[PDB]
């Protein structure tokens, strides 16, 4: 249910992004599919900026890639990369 996705990038000015994310997994194929935007908190930084979209797959944060990582490791990478962040988050996403 991933489709054919294009890679997009944008800069999000800045608590936090105000974004909830979740790992997706196919149980029939026993495969992690990546980290996806589940909700954008109304009135948070990503909401005010408008360029992030629900169901986007998160690919990179400030150049730190989430690819080649199981969902647990990618989530940890996300948290670690956001822990050091007025500011600017450069996101790479994959969008259907």
């Amino acid at each position: 249910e991933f489709g054919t996705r294009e890679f997009l990038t944008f800069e999000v000015p800045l608590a936090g992004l105000g974004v909830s994310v979740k790992g997706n997994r196919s149980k029939e194929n026993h495969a992690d599919l990546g980290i996806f935007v589940k909700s954008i908190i109304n009135g948070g930084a990503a909401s005010k900026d408008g360029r992030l979209r629900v169901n986007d797959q998160l690919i990179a944060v400030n150049g730190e890639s989430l690819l080649g990582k199981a969902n647990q490791e990618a989530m940890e990478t996300l948290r670690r990369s956001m822990s050091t962040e007025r500011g600017m988050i450069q996101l790479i996403v994959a969008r259907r």
Binding site: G16, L17, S20, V21, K22, L78, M82
Partner: peptide, 5 residues
């Protein structure tokens, strides 16, 4: 399983 950033 759901994290908020």
């Amino acid at each position: 399983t759901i994290i908020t950033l």
